[model samples]
Target: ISPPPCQGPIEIKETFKYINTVVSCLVFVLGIIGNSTLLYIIYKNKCMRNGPNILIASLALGDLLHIVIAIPINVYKLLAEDWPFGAEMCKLVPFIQKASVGITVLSLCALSIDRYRAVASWSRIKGIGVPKWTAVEIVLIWVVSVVLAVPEAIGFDIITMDYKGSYLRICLLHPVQKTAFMQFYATAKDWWLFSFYFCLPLAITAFFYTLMTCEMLRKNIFEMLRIDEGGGSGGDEAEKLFNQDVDAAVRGILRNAKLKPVYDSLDAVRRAALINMVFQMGETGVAGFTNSLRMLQQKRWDEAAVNLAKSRWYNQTPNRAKRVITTFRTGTWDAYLNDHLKQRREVAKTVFCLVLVFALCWLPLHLARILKLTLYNQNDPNRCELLSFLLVLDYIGINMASLNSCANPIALYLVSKRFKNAFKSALCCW
Candidate 1:
């Protein structure tokens, strides 16, 4: 017996329902606790009010709001397999979600830049830099994100799609790519937004920090030169003189001494600065590249899709040989690669966090869209069953993105020593 056209198999609905239930429950629970705790931490500790902490707090607040606004609607959407909320609520909810995600990305970029400035450019920029402004910046980022998303909300409406002759009105962008605004929206979905949102700030951070790092390296080099200049100072006077000479030399360097006395053979400042600059540059380059892709997607650039198809961005399957080689050669590679591993854990932590969001939240919706458009045929039972798996994966992924809000605090608590100590202290006091 042939399955009627436009009729979905019973198994597809069942699979989707099961997946939706588990994902929604987990995400709601995590979003509630994770966001609340982060807010609590900020209120409890004065030290946690720094730039990074401020950005973290903002991220939490937005994530919490996202869960509050989005989770319930998604749950309802899943169970009823229909939008219970009218058109207005549906449009608003998704917009808020998009804005919240945008703000979170901005917050992360701000945090990275703040860290770079504090660590690498403290001496030069410290007097002028105001950490309190981080809070202000966060507020502004959210404001701007929300503003950008307003049009999206305004333009959205429910549209009916015949799923196996059972007419379903699903929440989606209104007019379905026919309107003039569709072209603008599609163009906006590319990497340019990603660059403005993430890369520009990141570049600024790397630039200032790298320069500062160079300065620090220079100081260390000069210190080594001083040590080499005075051969084994045994007595107190020799030691005192050595200190005085080093101080004078440092002062001279600071004051732009062009034809000053050359003390040693080794140029500590130059070599060390070069090495540090190269290392930091490479790291920033990789991050910036990744961010650009994300930006392109957000803007809906057609070129970005072509680039993504050509690149390794979506390569999920691992190569066994490559994995084995990487493991075996860990920490035993080129100077650049060796240096990259120095802060591997921290880098991995951030990458993992972002990857989680990408995999869980964004991928499912995209994959589901692909299956709906390309593979699923209403008349074909076997193909329909296969497509159901993709639907399940999509629901799971989106729920996973939602659940991420809670996991971030845990990730921070584990990876950031300062966060851990503050958390522990707060617990002890309680």
Candidate 2:
């Protein structure tokens, strides 16, 4: 039986009702097409016959059922139309819809649990009989879903009422009583169903997934620490070897005073020059000394010069820096530098390169502008050509300046790993 007649007016306006109908139709069409394709793909691929795919396919199946059974009736209702499918469908349709929803939620929980088990104990549980257990879980999911939907199947009814002087039919929850006890019971039942169907499953899924994440992170940290420790030891041994080589080269240089330049007498002055040269040229400067040290330790002057000349540093630099490096490499003072002259020339070279680049970039734009202005005054036919050329230059300049602005940030990303990772994450959807 329908509820007692309403004491107030009840109306469904056409304005929002039409919009609702359109939205409902869209949802129905998209849901059907998307889920149908998903189901087909899972079915066709043998590789997808694993536990994860099975759970995914189950979810898709439920969604397909939901779209097919519930969406059409919903669209009709949104149109302010009556339920025309009679009493059997009135009970059965919502029951199927609710069960599909329940199945979808339960399947998600199943999937989460499966993922946790696989991650947490993959080594211990190889194969793990997942396929057989996955089939069993699917059966259990449907069984539980159907059982939970029994109340909806039995307890809903078609209610007839008068609204705006027209008889309207509505599907409503049955056994809605006026008594206080029954009302209290319904409220309690609603809360219980909400916790069972939504909250508990969600909480369980979250807990398992969180546990899996923590375990994976812990393992990753352990691996990183192990690798860092190994690298640290290797670095220490290499540093020790480098110090030994530097000391041996310094001692060998002092032993051969005849090969040294006349400007330097003390061991300390010779050692300082060698260190500076080594810093400038790195391994190439170091390799230059090996044969020279061997020749000097054997007390061979002519052979020492031949050995130093054979070095890579001999061909690379001009007289001053080359002299400093050759003296270091040959364990002798064959070179000397006036510090002031060296500093002045280095500063000049740096400034010259900077000015050269600046001129190359701006010279075209400046010349174009000057030519445009000159032709504009005389009203030359080529004035338009110059104007167009100036416009093209202006465009190129603006774009180049914009590109230069982006270059700093691009270089920062290349140079700084942390900044690059942060920028990548900021741009990503997650």
Candidate 3:
């Protein structure tokens, strides 16, 4: 009983087989398609190396490795209820998982630090920012991953367990002995994984993102002020705050007591329409749709959308207003992303989404590790139920991270016509 539930897709091989197998199959199918599609889009395009492609490629490659290498073995475990893979493979499986995560985290870490550099390249440092150097960085990312992952070979072992009165072999982190050095090594590994994989990345990303924002706003603010002085329709300093204010507006519309659940429940395409409308009009401005929001929440799409035709905002921007409402009604991104906003802006927005996805998808996996370490084991007590939950949560957390393999290309496809067009051309022609 101790070992049976402790195993997960290894432990829960008995209880959650169906749910775990479903996710394993789904992740493999979608991760294979989405990750490969992204890789193809970048590979087919000669201009891909011209921006952020190196780390994106590595990240995609890691997703594919996780998909191709890790998930099937999990499926095998999910179905078989034991480790049929030989002892060597038991070690190798964990290596692939750790190495891929190492690749994922390092790629993102370097990529984020490299983010501000791409924008600065045109004027400040010049000469197209050295593709040669980027390749070097990519090389180091893999090397570092392999180095971090080498320990998995020694630390993981296949051990026997009892399941339904039969013996089962499970692969997990096995300390060689109950020694001080053993506990310290295990503790150090957990701490290092937590620190490098989640904690450092989050802190560095937030800090550098704010630094980049400060730089961008300084330039944008001066431009607006200069334009204002030169006799044009222009902005003040308060206007510089509008970007964050608009995000708040979008969230405000999303947070409505009666409407929030519906908004959250909607497909992301339909949800985008609401956020876009809030982005265009202030949250308060969009909130004027008191009846429309209710009607939208109530699923009266035509009434909710058409009612907007009577508004001053609707009259001010006729076709654009129709485009947003059409997106809400039809549940499509076509009308929304087709706007005349510059391609560069859309690409930057897409980049932000990718990083956001990186943070969100991996956060749960690391949290699982956090909970396992932080919550001391009660061994066999009332906490057996609670510890069993830890295993379940840990399993779900990892699957959520694994799902990121597909999520990247999904976000790219949604926010970016450039990415979509490139993806279309690759699959269509080839």
Model 2: residues with Cα > 4 Å off, grouped in runs = 1-13, 122-130, 176-189, 226-430
**Highest TM-score scorer:** 3
Best first by TM-score, ranked: 3, 1, 2
Instruction: For residue 38, give model 1's deviation from the true position in Å.
Output: 1.0
Indicate whether candidate 1 or candidate 2 has the larger lDDT: 1
lDDT of 1 by residue, 299-416 (tens): 4334433443443522532232222122222312222232223333343344345434433445455555555656667567577566556666666655565666667777777776
The model with the greater TM-score, 1 or 2, is 1
- Model 3 alpha-carbon miss at residue 315, Å: 22
TM-score of each: 0.58, 0.48, 0.68
Error of 2 at 194 (Å): 2.6
How many clashing pairs per prediction, in order? 14, 2, 4
Poorly placed runs, candidate 3 (over 4 Å): 1-13, 121-130, 163-165, 177-183, 226-344, 379-381, 428-430
For residues 319-391, write the lDDT of model 2, one tens digit per residue: 4445554554455322432332233233233223322332343345444444444454425544444444455
